[PDB]
Amino acid sequence: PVNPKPFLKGLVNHRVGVKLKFNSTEYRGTLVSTDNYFNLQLNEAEEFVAGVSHGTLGEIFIRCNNVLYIRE
């Protein structure tokens, strides 16, 4: 019943957790919006390089090709 796009839409204005393949860094932040190509836009971004945080980014954007999954 619950589609992927729909889920994504729902998740806007809420916490999100994306992880990439090349250089695995868990990006943690509040999701802003998304397009047809599945591009990400985060707020209060924290680049957790395998648990440990590099630094508090703030507002940020993320490409579609790099990311693996999306979760709470």
């Binding site: 250089n23 802003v32 919006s33 591009n39 990400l40 836009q41 971004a45 703030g58 954007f61 490409r63």
Partner: protein, 94 residues
Amino acid sequence: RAELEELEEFEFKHGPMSLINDAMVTRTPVIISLRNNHKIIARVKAFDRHCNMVLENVKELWTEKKGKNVINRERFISKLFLRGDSVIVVLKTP
């Protein structure tokens, strides 16, 4: 024909690239990453649909040494035209 492509122009300002667009509009620095352990810093100027950007004040940071001892090299470039595939993440600093 026209309305299909023309409607996609406003989609940049609504979706994920909205921030990028804003940055472009009001010239400010942004940390651009790469595939092979690279870290670039530059202020945006132009933009595109598939993230084919062009910026000024290109400060590059990349390693060219072994795992034992790092070496943060630096070089001041400008007016580049980086491809959208290599661009992983961008963010507008305050």
